[PDB]
């Protein structure tokens, strides 16, 4: 019975690892987006920009903002939204007996 418990615990730990991996990939893409937005803002700051250049930079920034929203609302592990703010604190049985669990939480 404990061997069966160990097998299921290993499976659950691997599932948690995969969920964390997917979330980490989405986070990496999101931080790339944020770096690009920072570069856009810094470019807009420069004095010699008139107004139209600022409008184009703002259009790019709003596109990237909606992309960030789409990422936050879309990445999912088989129908389980990860970074949309719904996951919250979730357990992952990684022990043979009852009373072993790693709490993982993914803020939106």
């Amino acid at each position: 019975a404990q061997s069966r418990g160990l097998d299921v615990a290993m499976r659950n730990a691997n599932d948690g690892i995969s969920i964390a991996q997917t979330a980490e990939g989405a986070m990496n893409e999101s931080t790339s987006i944020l770096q690009r937005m920072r570069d856009l803002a810094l470019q807009s700051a420069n004095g010699t920009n008139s107004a139209s250049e600022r409008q184009a930079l703002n259009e790019e920034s709003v596109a990237l903002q909606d992309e960030l929203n789409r990422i936050a609302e879309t990445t999912s592990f088989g129908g389980r939204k990860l970074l949309n703010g719904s996951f919250g604190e979730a357990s992952f049985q990684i022990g043979s007996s009852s009373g072993e669990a790693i709490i993982m939480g993914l803020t939106s």
Partner: protein
């Protein structure tokens, strides 16, 4: 915009498959096991889109049309629900198979 609203509604729940047709009309799909009765909607936003939740149009796999954008968007949810139902039935058959195997060993 309408598309972002559809994505958000999809994200915030798993009983709905929001969608958008060619003209920009929010298509809300409710899988068969998830609805029983008059699906009623309220709120100011729904009046803003003019939505009207009632008995709903009954659509199965045989009633899938793809020539229109909205047809395909609705079909996505239709196939999702159909896949869920077929997978549930296969799970039931597998459970019966396992029970049969255990019973046959016990009988021997």
């Amino acid at each position: 915009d309408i598309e972002e609203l559809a994505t958000y509604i999809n994200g915030q729940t798993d009983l709905f498959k929001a969608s958008v047709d060619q003209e920009g009309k929010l298509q809300i799909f409710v899988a068969e096991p998830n609805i029983e009765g008059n699906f009623n909607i309220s709120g100011g936003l729904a009046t803003e889109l003019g939505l009207n939740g009632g008995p709903g149009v009954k659509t199965t796999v045989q009633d899938i049309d793809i020539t229109s954008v909205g047809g395909s968007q609705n079909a996505v949810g239709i196939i999702d629900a159909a896949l869920k139902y077929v997978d549930s039935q296969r799970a039931d058959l597998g459970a019966k198979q396992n029970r049969l195997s255990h019973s046959i060993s016990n009988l021997s």
